[PDB]
Each structure stands twice: as C-alpha cells, then as structure tokens.
Amino acid sequence: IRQFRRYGDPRYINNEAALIRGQWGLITADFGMVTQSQMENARLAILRRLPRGSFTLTMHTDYEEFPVHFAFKFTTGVPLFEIMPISARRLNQAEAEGIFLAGRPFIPLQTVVVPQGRVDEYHVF
Amino acid sequence: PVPLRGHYCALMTLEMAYEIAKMKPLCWGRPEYPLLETRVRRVVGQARRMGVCFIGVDTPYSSPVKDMT
Amino acid sequence: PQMVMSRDELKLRCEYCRFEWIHDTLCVRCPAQPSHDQREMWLHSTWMWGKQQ
Amino acid sequence: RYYALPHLRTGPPMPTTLEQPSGEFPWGKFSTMVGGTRIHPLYRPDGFFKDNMYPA
Amino acid sequence: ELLHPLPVRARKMEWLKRDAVEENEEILRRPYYTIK
Amino acid sequence: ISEQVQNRVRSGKELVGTVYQKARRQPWAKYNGMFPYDYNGPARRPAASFVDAPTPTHNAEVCGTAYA
Amino acid sequence: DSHKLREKLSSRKGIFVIDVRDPGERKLNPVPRSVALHHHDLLSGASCPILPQQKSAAELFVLASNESRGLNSAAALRRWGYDSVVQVDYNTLVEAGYV
Amino acid sequence: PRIPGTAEQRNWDPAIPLFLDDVDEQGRPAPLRDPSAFVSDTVKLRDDKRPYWSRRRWALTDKFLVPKSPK
RNA sequence: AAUAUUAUUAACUAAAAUGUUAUAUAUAAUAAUCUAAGUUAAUUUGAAUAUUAAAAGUAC
Ligand SMILES: [Mg+2]
Ligand SMILES: [Zn+2]
C-alpha cells in the first residue's frame, strides 16, 4: 500500500529458473513493467492462432500489481503463457514459436519460448 | 475420426478386413502381390482412421468361441 | 518497397522472388507482383560524412 | 564458515546417468540439413530427383 | 557529460595499472621471514 | 588450386564445352562496397623468405636477357 | 620397515627428516637428527633455502604425529617442487634404529 | 608470524592458502588409490551468419525474435 | 580553553612520464538440366475442396 518509486524493483536477475507445466511457455527475458491490457491483447492474439480442439492457453496473472495505475513488475525468467495439450499433439519449436509470435509484439519486453519441463537457462541466456 | 466425436463407430473383426483387402491387389495379373498380411494393415489403419472399432486389435480379447476353453 | 529493420526480418514471399544487392544494401526483388519488394533499411546510396554520420 | 565442494570419492565429474535433458529442441543434424554435416562428396544423399536418380 | 570514447592506449595504461597492483599483492603474500 | 580443382573435377552442375554457360557473368549484380582491407590495407602475412640460400657468386655480373 | 631400514641406514649421511610436530611432544619423543620445522613454516615458503637445491634428486621424510598434517605438509612440499616425500610417524623410525 | 599477510588480506584473496592445521582444506581427505575437459573456453572470433545464398536454409534458420529497446 | 559573529589561488632558468584518435561497413558459394499412374479423391464440416476451404492429426 502506497509504495514508493523504489519498490518491487524488477531490475535484479533472479535465481529461480521457472518450471513450466504446459507443453510450451513464454518467458520474460528482460526487466520491465507490463500492463494488464497488454497481456490481454497478447492472450487474444495467441488464441487466434491456437487449435482450440487440442490446446489450452494458461496465463500466469497471480503476480503482484504495482502502482504507477496498476501494472506488473517483471524480473527475468518469469513465465507468462503456457500451451497445454488436451491430446497427443506435439508441436515443433518452429510451430510453438510461430504461435507465440502473434502475442510477442503486444508485450513491451523481450520474451523467449521455452519447451516443457524446467527452463534450461544456460541455453536460453 | 474418434477425437472429433469421442465415441467409436461400428465394431469390426479382422476377418472382414481380409475380404475387403482381398479385393484390392497391386496388379490383377498377379493377385498374390502385395501380401495380405501386410496390405491388410492399410485397410485396418484406414478404417482406424475412419473411426472403426476393432476386435483382434484395440480390444484385449478375441470374439468368443462357443465350443472351446 | 517496404523497409525491413534488418536482414533477419527479410523473407522470400513468392516463387519468383530473389535476393539482390543494391550497392552493399541487401534487398528482395520480385519481377512479378512488385508489392513484395523489400529493402534492408541502411544508408543512402550516396552519402558524405558530415551529411550522413 | 567457508564453503567448498566435497572431493570426488567415486564416479565421473559430469553426471552421466543423471544428465539433465539438454534444453535445446533436438533436431538431428542430418534430419535438418543446415550445418555441421561433413559428408564426403562420394556419400552425398537425397539426390533422388536430381543426380541420385542416375546412380553410380 | 562524457561524450567521445576513451582512446585505446589510455585503457592500455589502465590495464598496466591493474597488473601493477597485482604485482604488489604478490609481494604482499610472501612470508615475513626466511630461514637461511 | 581451387579453380584447378574445379576444372579437373566432373561437370555435373554446370556445362563444359558448350556455348551457353547457364551461370551468366554478372559483375554489376554482385557486392559493391568496401571491405575493411580496402581501408586498412591488405592483411599482413609473413614475408616469403629463402632459408639457407647459397652465397651469391657473380653478384657483380649482370644476367643477359635469356632468349638465347 | 623391511624397505625403509636400509634406506635410512648408511645409504647416505643425513639430515633428511623434516618433522612438523608439536613442540610439546618433540620434547617428549625427540628424534635428534631432524630439522624441527613448523608446518606453516613449510607451506609458506620460508624454509626454501635450507631445503635442498635440486628438486628431483631429493627424497624427504615428513615426521608427523597426526597423519592429517603429514598429508598437509606433503602437499606443502610438492608445491615447491619436492615430489618424493615419505610420511613417517615416530614409532616407525624406532625400529629403523634412527632413534 | 608464520602466516603471510594480515587478516584483511586473507579474507580478500583466494591465493594465499588456508593455513588450517589438522584438517584437509576442502572437506574431508581425498582418496588415494581435469576441469578443462567440460569447461569451454573457445573464443569464437567471427560470428556465424545466416545463409542467404540458400533458399531452404534461409527459412529453416529463421530466428523468431522481436527487437525491443528498454523502456 | 577564553572571547567575536550565523539563517581556483605558480619566484626565475631549465628538466618533465598523459595525446591523440581504435569511424559506420562485410563478400564468394541457386537460375534452378533429368521426372507416367496406382491404400487415397481417408473420414467428418461443406453447395463444392482430391496434400494446400474448415476440422482432425503419432492409421498405414
Ligand atoms: Mg481440401
Ligand atoms: Zn513476392
């Protein structure tokens, strides 16, 4: 409540390499602040490119909102979206990245597409 | 196709698949080739692809015989 | 022609489309359907030092 | 307190049976032909409609 | 403000300052006495 | 060496002996621009030297044009 | 010491034994031909000029009570180029007639 | 002292050895019966470029990436 | 301590180790000669659609 300009500073690089439960995931590569509306735009743009018969888009919104207006302060490596399978459909990297490519522009900071399991942050970074 | 619906269409024995596959050879000059045991799978798998349920296969057991243990 | 930000953002959209060099600037020309033409954005073909950095 | 690694009593320095999966997307070098394929020109593949239609 | 880059030989001299400092600390890690 | 290797290896890609030449000469189409060796000069390589050459007897004498 | 015995008898003269050992027990035990060093005085490199000049030709005996500092001082010595180092405790060189 | 350097130098510099007496420096004693094998220092001088002279390798080497300047 | 107030500045003559510039810039390697058809036009959605309308994609 009534937090100062220096609070929840995203600028540090985190030690937590996230674990993405979904088959694919979209992960924050830099520091920044993201508006909710931007993530909604991203979500809709991604849902345009998904085969809704085999797939479900999971958005991680549970992070704190910080006053500016309320937005998110994102550290490197924080997961955003998850492509979760309802069936045996196994995407390639080109396909998954082609899917997240729609929603990348709306997000103001750089993002990486990461495959199922734990982020291998030697390869990502 | 099954995931499109979520239920199989009609049951079929592999007995019937042979008499379907008997009819399509590669060359009528030589009926034996290609061999049934192989090319039957094309029929089985296409029926599969159609959504046909099967007996020999995709269910554990073989259709009951009255007279034998 | 539309100017792409860099060489990576440059794709061949059609069957007849080609990579060509405009004086050290890499570009894409289609003899059919000219709306497919892409330039890499870079310095003018003629530039001095004070005039262009 | 100072912190230091234990010695090696047994087994290899880099985990062999315990390998983490490597995090790249596993595209074979020969399955996607891009680079790192050093193939002798005698052994050149996939010419089936160009020069490997008229072999040897 | 600082506008134009540092020239190369300046930072070469700075590197020389670094290993001069190091040359000092090696001396400092030598023993207090010597048994002869 | 490489062009000689190109010559004495078989013609499978391009036409030998024929006057067509599928790959047409287009010098103007290629890269026009200067490389860093166009500014800083040709890259330095070790000067080609003669080791253990015998001493030059007749260094005072002049070589005759050898057409004879 | 069916090997060590003839090694230390008459094979050469000697001052060959560096004992890194507590000052308390080197009065109790004492081996009176050994140079009494301190194990810190070895590792540090403050003993180098009295240690023999040719690094390869030498073989030195570390006389230690606790074997852990025998193992420490071995490394201390091979840091300065002494590779052949034999660790001996007190009772060992009793049977060798060295005391 | 028989210990080179002051305390400030000791807890600055990982060159001066630990002067621990009766224990091994690194955990418990090593068994008596090569870091560079897995550590890669290979400096790649020229950055490998993208094959515009081949049509298939151009699109197969595609990098899906959006340039973003920091805000 | 005792008292009084308050809202960069180069003797002279020489010596002297620290100013100059590392400018943006990467090419060669595609014009690219050769070929009959055959589970199969799978099935669904659709008026139609046969690899390339949508759906579904580990049948062979
Ligand atoms: Mg269709
Ligand atoms: Zn085009």
Side-chain angles (χ1 to χ4, degrees), chain A residues 1-17:
Chain A
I1 313 176
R2 185 17 171 67
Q3 309 84 333
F4 211 68
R5 178 172 57 109
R6 281 72 165 56
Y7 176 76
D9 231 358
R11 288 187 297 206
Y12 69 98
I13 300 172
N14 64 357
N15 45 0
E16 284 99 355

Side-chain angles (χ1 to χ4, degrees), chain D residues 2 5 7 9 14 33, chain H residues 25-26 28 31 38 56-57:
Chain D
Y2 73 94
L5 292 174
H7 274 284
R9 201 66 14 119
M14 237 34 63
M33 286 273 189
Chain H
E25 183 176 352
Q26 194 179 4
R28 54 96 79 86
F38 48 90
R56 63 169 187 85
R57 288 192 284 117

Side-chain angles (χ1 to χ4, degrees), chain G residues 10-69:
Chain G
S10 77
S11 187
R12 63 272 178 87
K13 310 175 171 179
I15 298 160
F16 284 83
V17 187
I18 293 106
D19 56 334
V20 283
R21 199 165 80 246
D22 302 335
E25 56 183 351
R26 77 156 64 86
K27 197 266 172 295
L28 184 55
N29 286 321
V31 182
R33 37 191 197 271
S34 56
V35 191
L37 271 313
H38 192 73
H39 57 293
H40 289 117
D41 210 347
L42 206 52
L43 180 57
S44 169
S47 296
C48 290
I50 68 174
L51 265 51
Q53 299 85 17
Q54 51 276 32
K55 308 293 182 178
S56 63
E59 62 92 17
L60 300 166
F61 293 106
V62 167
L63 175 60
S65 186
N66 295 321
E67 57 89 19
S68 60
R69 83 172 67 183

Side-chain angles (χ1 to χ4, degrees), chain E residues 29-36, chain G residues 37 41 44-47 49-50:
Chain E
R29 84 173 44 105
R30 282 167 48 169
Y32 284 97
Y33 63 97
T34 308
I35 298 178
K36 298 183 179 297
Chain G
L37 271 313
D41 210 347
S44 169
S47 296
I50 68 174

Side-chain angles (χ1 to χ4, degrees), chain A residues 30-63:
Chain A
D30 286 337
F31 326 122
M33 291 193 67
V34 181
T35 313
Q36 286 183 355
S37 64
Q38 290 171 348
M39 288 188 67
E40 290 174 350
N41 295 319
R43 173 171 188 168
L44 297 179
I46 288 175
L47 278 176
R48 290 180 189 178
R49 285 188 184 167
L50 282 177
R52 297 187 179 175
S54 56
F55 277 147
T56 304
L57 180 64
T58 299
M59 176 173 70
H60 295 274
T61 184
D62 57 346
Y63 305 104

Side-chain angles (χ1 to χ4, degrees), chain E residues 12-13 32:
Chain E
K12 284 186 178 179
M13 297 303 114
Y32 284 97

